[PDB]
Amino acid sequence: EVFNATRFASVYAWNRKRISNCVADYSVLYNSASFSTFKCYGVSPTKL
């Protein structure tokens, strides 16, 4: 819902979605999607 997002919010009125009660499998994300800037602040991508 976050990543493929067919109707996707504008920048002047952006959308905030709460995520709860699940597991964050990062390996699924880059199977079919390529991210240009995966900048991470405060938390290293290795220890995510």
Binding site: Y30, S34, F35, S36, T37, F38, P45, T46, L48
Partner: protein
């Protein structure tokens, strides 16, 4: 120019445009976890 090196090695691979950032110490993805990982105390330069 003023240095003289002892043990040099030239890695060689083709990656897509989004994954050039992944060839760096500490970055993750499907190119820096499953294909080619650079050491944390790396000393050299990546030319793409």
């Amino acid at each position: 120019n003023d240095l003289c090196f002892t043990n040099v090695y030239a890695d060689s691979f083709v990656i897509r445009g989004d994954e050039v950032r992944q060839i760096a110490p500490g970055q993750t993805g499907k190119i820096a976890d499953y294909n080619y990982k650079l050491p944390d105390d790396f000393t050299g330069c990546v030319i793409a």
